[PDB]
Amino acid sequence: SMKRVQPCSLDPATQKLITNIFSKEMFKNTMALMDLDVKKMPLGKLSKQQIARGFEALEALEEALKGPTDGGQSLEELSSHFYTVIPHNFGHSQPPPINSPELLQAKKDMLLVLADIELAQALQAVSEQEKTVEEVPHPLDRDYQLLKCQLQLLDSGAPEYKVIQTYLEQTGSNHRCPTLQHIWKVNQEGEEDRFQAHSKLGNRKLLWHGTNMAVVAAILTSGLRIMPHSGGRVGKGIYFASENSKSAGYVIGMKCGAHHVGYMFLGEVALGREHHINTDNPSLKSPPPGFDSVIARGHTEPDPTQDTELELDGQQVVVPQGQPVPCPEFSSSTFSQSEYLIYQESQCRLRYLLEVH
Numbered sequence: 581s582m583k584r585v586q587p588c589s590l591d592p593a594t595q596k597l598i599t600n601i602f603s604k605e606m607f608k609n610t611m612a613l614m615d616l617d618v619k620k621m622p623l624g625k626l627s628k629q630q631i632a633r634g635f636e637a638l639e640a641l642e643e644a645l646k647g648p649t650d651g652g653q654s655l656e657e658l659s660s661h662f663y664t665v666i667p668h669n670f671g672h673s674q675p676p677p678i679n680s681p682e683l684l685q686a687k688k689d690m691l692l693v694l695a696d697i698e699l700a701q702a703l704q705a706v707s708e709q710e711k712t713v714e715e716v717p718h719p720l721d722r723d724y725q726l727l728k729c730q731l732q733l734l735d736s737g738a739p740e741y742k743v744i745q746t747y748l749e750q751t752g753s754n755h756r757c758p759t760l761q762h763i764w765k766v767n768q769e770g771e772e773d774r775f776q777a778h779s780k781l782g783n784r785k786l787l788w789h790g791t792n793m794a795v796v797a798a799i800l801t802s803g804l805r806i807m808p809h810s811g812g813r814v815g816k817g818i819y820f821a822s823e824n825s826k827s828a829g830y831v832i833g834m835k836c837g838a839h840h841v842g843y844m845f846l847g848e849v850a851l852g853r854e855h856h857i858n859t860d861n862p863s864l865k866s867p868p869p870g871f872d873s874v875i876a877r878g879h880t881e882p883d884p885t886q887d888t889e890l891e892l893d894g895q896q897v898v899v900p901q902g903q904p905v906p907c908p909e910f911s912s913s914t915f916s917q918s919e920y921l922i923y924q925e926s927q928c929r930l931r932y933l934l935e936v937h
């Protein structure tokens with residue numbers, strides 16, 4: 581017989597969030613923005629095997645880019661294999677050869693996003709328990725439940741609301757700052773325990789992490805992650821910024837009606853003893869011995885004299901509130917704005933999610 585659909589328990593803002601982060605249109609938009617052939621790679625067809633085969637093909641390119649010339653297959657031939665595994669669309673012209681470190685990392689990053697899209701699809705698979713029960717949750721409750729992540733919408737007068745708003749406003753773009761729509765407190769439990777393990781580290785800061793909308797569901801289910809092919813200017817870690825405007829550059833939003841909707845995280849990061857750098861080092865896989873984080877220091881930093889603190893689970897967590905000011909020691913840094921790196925997933929726990937227009 582027909583199953584009852586129970587009424588949705590979620591507030592309107594949370595329903596919109598849930599709709600957005602599981603939206604098939606959103607996921608396909610994201611694949612189009614990454615030059616993927618959505619006709620050849622429908623969401624239902626995405627598989628862990630294909631994604632692994634994709635990374636294998638990129639691993640062969642990487643070896644060709646580094647270690648020869650030694651009689652291996654040409655970059656063209658190796659590129660062609662990759663494009664067979666992971667179909668791309670360049671207006672049905674031939675896709676281009678993956679013949680630089682930059683392009684190799686860009687393709688690795690594309691596959692990391694695609695892997696989180698596939699995660700979201702796999703998460704939504706209907707269980708046998710669900711086929712047998714005679715009543716089902718509203719689809720949005722079901723999707724929310726799949727995250728195994730508590731989201732609590734804040735209002736204006738929550739203790740931390742003004743602190744968060746100030747952090748956004750003071751360190752966001754001066755001319756056209758993202759407009760704050762909603763903040764949710766994020767409690768992904770089973771993040772709590774591994775995070776407790778760094779309770780000794782006094783130097784905690786609440787930092788920005790901007791992402792593709794297509795990876796928000798994955799992050800809510802599993803936290804911020806370091807994957808085998810993660811990389812960037814400061815190597816294989818989790819990247820954060822103290823300046824919203826830096827992180828905002830990584831937000832991939834979506835046009836909805838007359839607005840552009842984007843999501844940004846704030847994580848509590850146990851930075852411990854910081855190692856400061858002033859030139860790019862893509863080879864890093866941990867801080868130097870004796871250090872707990874690497875901070876690629878920018879020409880500017882939110883003015884430290886305006887820092888405040890929030891008390892999160894009884895630990896003081898620094899929250900910048902100042903506009904960015906120059907840091908003379910780092911005026912010649914290769915970095916305009918700071919990038920904060922950790923190399924263990926346990927050193928971050930998600931605290932807030934912001935919707936910005």
Ligand SMILES: C[C@H](NC(=O)CCc1nc2ccccc2c(=O)[nH]1)c1ccccc1
Binds near residue numbers: 790791795820
């Ligand atoms: C490729 C994508 N990476 C990101 O979402 C990180 C984006 C990001 N990079 C930064 C770099 C320097 C400073 C700040 C940031 C940031 O806020 N986000 C990814 C990484 C792993 C799994 C799924 C997706």
